[PDB]
Amino acid sequence: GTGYDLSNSVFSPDGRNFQVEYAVKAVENGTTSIGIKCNDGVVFAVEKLITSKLLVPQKNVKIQVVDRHIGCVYSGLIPDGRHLVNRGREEAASFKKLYKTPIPIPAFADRLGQYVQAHTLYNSVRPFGVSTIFGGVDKNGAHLYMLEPSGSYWGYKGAATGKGRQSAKAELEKLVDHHPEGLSAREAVKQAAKIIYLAHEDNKEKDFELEISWCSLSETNGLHKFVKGDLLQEAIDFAQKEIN
């Protein structure tokens, strides 16, 4: 019969979970955001559609930090994203409190994973309406991850989600091939600003505002920090230039 798509933990005859798949639609309908792993860190960037001139510039920040070494960006239902970071922040505090060492990115990833997967087990809750890109530097390197509404997640070399995920994923695949030796923190920052300007075409109608953040063992000391002022402008230019 039918109706398999009205309740969250229900398996359709083909073994799928429609509500989760619908949530994904909500993710695809959102702003585009990415993650670029580099030789000693990771860079995060996202598109911020300027609905109007009334929006105070540079204010409505979207990228989020967890603990002091993890960065998180997401596309889809924004509030759902904050909810997931909040959980991650508790998840992290808990880990550090018992083990003393700040939480490893892989460990942190499973924390979010298990929690998100949890919301696909009962019909009393709704799956998350976002795909999250997050990562950081730890005891053994940098790590980049992307988590889907199904609770699925893997480690990436580069990742993108949202409206222009294809443009981005395309630009990202190039970089991966033409840089087997690995990009650099400084380079990844400009590269990111570009992938974002390109992926903005799938939304070229509204004006936007770029946002970048990075976590590099050498550029930030393994701590997550936002790109501001000069370094930011230098990247906007590198993008605005190659967009022509």
């Binding site: 920040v61 989020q64 930090v65 603990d67 002091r68 922040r89 505090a93 409190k97 936002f226």
Partner: protein
Amino acid sequence: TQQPIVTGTSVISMKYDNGVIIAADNLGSYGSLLRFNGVERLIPVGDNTVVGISGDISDMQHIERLLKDLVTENAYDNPLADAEEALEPSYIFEYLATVMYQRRSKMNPLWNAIIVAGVQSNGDQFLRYVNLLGVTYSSPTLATGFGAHMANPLLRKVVDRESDIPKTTVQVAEEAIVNAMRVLYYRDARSSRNFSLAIIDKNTGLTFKKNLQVENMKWDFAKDIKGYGTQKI
């Protein structure tokens, strides 16, 4: 309700014209046994605040973790975390004072005497005290335990009232703190010769000096002292 085990003695402090100074030796006693010597009892929070703690060391280490967490938390979703919205000494104090009182009210205190020293964003000096009972107060000079009896009298001879703050210089002030530490080494049987000193100046910022030592002590006259009254040799 508990009972302290490993403890730290005095924490002295005072404010001068441009900031505040605070010091505490590096000892961690276990009753009469001077067990640990590499104990830092001065907790810097941010760069405009230093928290000096005395009492149970295990409880101190706990307050240490709370403080680091306070910073991590203040950073969340805060774009002005290193500017207009960075932690102030008064915020750090009100928080600790809140905790101390709640814990004493649950009959399970954090066995400490704390002194929060720093400079507010508008330049004002901040110096306040809080202990296991939740009691709080401010004064141009502040000291805990033994220092309350020997350090305050000395330090007060420099800054006796509010009007003396602007007349006192870091040089004069630091001199007093350092002499007070020497006196405490003379009469406090739970003190160490090595200590840490920190200055929070509204212009020069935070200066944190480690591994200091009591110097210029007078002990020579001890050779003339023999017997306890009538003995001559």
